[PDB]
Write an enzyme that holds these catalytic residues in place. Sequence first.
Site, PDB file in Angstrom:
ATOM      1  CB  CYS A  31      -0.996  -0.030   1.152  1.00  0.00           C
ATOM      2  SG  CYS A  31      -1.900   1.512   1.380  1.00  0.00           S
TER       3      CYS A  31
ATOM      4  CE  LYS B 183     -10.662  -3.267   4.090  1.00  0.00           C
ATOM      5  NZ  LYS B 183     -11.081  -1.867   3.803  1.00  0.00           N
TER       6      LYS B 183
HETATM    7  C1  LIG Z   1      -3.637   1.194   1.139  1.00  0.00           C
HETATM    8  C2  LIG Z   1      -3.952   1.153  -0.295  1.00  0.00           C
HETATM    9  O1  LIG Z   1      -3.400   0.283  -0.957  1.00  0.00           O
HETATM   10  N1  LIG Z   1      -4.961   2.005  -0.690  1.00  0.00           N
HETATM   11  C3  LIG Z   1      -5.270   2.136  -2.001  1.00  0.00           C
HETATM   12  C4  LIG Z   1      -6.515   2.649  -2.374  1.00  0.00           C
HETATM   13  C5  LIG Z   1      -6.785   2.803  -3.729  1.00  0.00           C
HETATM   14  C6  LIG Z   1      -5.823   2.466  -4.712  1.00  0.00           C
HETATM   15 CL1  LIG Z   1      -6.196   2.635  -6.327  1.00  0.00          CL
HETATM   16  C7  LIG Z   1      -4.559   1.959  -4.383  1.00  0.00           C
HETATM   17  S1  LIG Z   1      -3.165   1.477  -5.782  1.00  0.00           S
HETATM   18  O2  LIG Z   1      -3.026   2.700  -6.688  1.00  0.00           O
HETATM   19  O3  LIG Z   1      -1.771   1.038  -5.222  1.00  0.00           O
HETATM   20  N2  LIG Z   1      -3.471   0.067  -6.867  1.00  0.00           N
HETATM   21  C8  LIG Z   1      -4.869  -0.044  -7.326  1.00  0.00           C
HETATM   22  C9  LIG Z   1      -2.926  -1.170  -6.249  1.00  0.00           C
HETATM   23  C10 LIG Z   1      -3.641  -1.469  -4.886  1.00  0.00           C
HETATM   24  O4  LIG Z   1      -2.870  -1.186  -3.673  1.00  0.00           O
HETATM   25  C11 LIG Z   1      -3.572  -1.777  -2.542  1.00  0.00           C
HETATM   26  C12 LIG Z   1      -4.308   1.831  -3.013  1.00  0.00           C
END
Ligand SMILES: *CC(=O)Nc1ccc(Cl)c(S(=O)(=O)N(C)CCOC)c1
EC number: 2.5.1.18
Lengths: 238, 238
Positions: B29, B56
């Site tokens: 994340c 979760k």
């Molecule tokens: C903590 C987290 O990962 N939040 C989050 C919320 C929305 C999005 Cl789009 C992302 S990301 O841009 O990294 N992608 C979609 C990969 C997912 O990562 C969890 C992250």
Amino acid sequence: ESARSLGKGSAPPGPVPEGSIRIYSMRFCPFAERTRLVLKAKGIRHEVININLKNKPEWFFKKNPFGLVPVLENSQGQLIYESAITCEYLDEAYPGKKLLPDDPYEKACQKMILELFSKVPSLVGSFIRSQNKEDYAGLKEEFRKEFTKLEEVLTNKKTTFFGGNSISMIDYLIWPWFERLEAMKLNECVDHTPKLKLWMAAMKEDPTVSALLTSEKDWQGFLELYLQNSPEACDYGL
Amino acid sequence: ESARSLGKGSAPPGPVPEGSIRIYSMRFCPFAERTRLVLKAKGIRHEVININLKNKPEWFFKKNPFGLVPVLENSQGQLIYESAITCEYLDEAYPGKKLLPDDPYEKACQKMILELFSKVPSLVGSFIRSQNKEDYAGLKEEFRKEFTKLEEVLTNKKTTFFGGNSISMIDYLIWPWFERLEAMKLNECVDHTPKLKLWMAAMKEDPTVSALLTSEKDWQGFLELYLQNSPEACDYGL
Ligand SMILES: *CC(=O)Nc1ccc(Cl)c(S(=O)(=O)N(C)CCOC)c1
Ligand SMILES: *CC(=O)Nc1ccc(Cl)c(S(=O)(=O)N(C)CCOC)c1
């Protein structure tokens, strides 16, 4: 006359005088109201330039590349934009009542409440898109879901205001959207949130809030012009 | 094994020990990476609980009503959420290198740059919605428009980093989206932004950045599982 907005063709303004800070504002903008409530609550000597947001001066993009109010400009020529940044800058840079707590956790709590509030300003947007009694019922439900979150914070803390028993930054940062609720006919949306409803009554008694409050007739005059895309919306009343 | 995520059915964790702070995180994340970069840059003793964001634990909503990482929990039982709030809280509450300036204007500048950056994380979102070479061309243009804004800040300041010649909060707050650019095949989007491209090379040399950097193979492993909605995406590699 003095409050009349500057727009396209207006002379770039001169340097901000020593001992004063300048806000580029618009009299009915809720974001810039945040900054004006802080200036007034802290007793900061300041001047106001009102920007015609429908008919911006080209020079205004030299103040803020995004072309948005509010913007602070000081005597040193420093520029600060984004409403929550302008408010925090003013609380740190100037003397008087501190509106944010010094304790890091209590300060973070005020920010987390602001986060709880973060969908409300785009719902006010969306209120424009409401055409009929059906869209108005949905809109009211959306405000209720957001207001329940703020209601929970007051029930947990059992304080008058969002930051304790005295009014503080977080109250002034959310107030301008509550001020506009009666004129948007969304007053009913606090009917299931009794503590939030008493918070609104306490806010209207605050000397700073009360000094900056616009009448419903004044806000309606603005909105009608705003919704035609009138270049005079910003100068309603003048 | 130790880094394995907690999910649905997992025992609520015990109290955070005195002398330590806890982060509820997820290893891939980018928002929680912000908080881990600060913990590491400031030398703060901490423990990590990884949350399975696809599965979760119900108890996790007691830590954060929004159900999102990152979340800090200290020995006193205080909870702090939202990535930029967790980072600022840590810079104020703990000793070591200050990552934000004390001067109010310079601090506001770091926040204004964060504001300049604020569309980038939702474009990374949107990268998921890209299906073909046409959508990928549009996506690349969108990243370029945002990167030009950051390029202008480095050309104005003529510093190595966004807050001066030393790395500071603002760099760590934007870094995690640049880290992911090569694995998203969006490396080309800094080709018209030569200073931003050198900033990325300087970031990868930072001891804190370098200690937390995930390999492209590791990020690809995660993304593929993430995009199936696999409950194991969060534990890729373990
Ligand atoms: C903590 C987290 O990962 N939040 C989050 C919320 C929305 C999005 Cl789009 C992302 S990301 O841009 O990294 N992608 C979609 C990969 C997912 O990562 C969890 C992250
Ligand atoms: C400064 C300001 O007025 N900004 C701004 C941006 C978007 C929206 Cl939707 C608003 S509003 O909710 O008050 N409403 C649409 C009336 C317009 O106010 C200018 C305000």
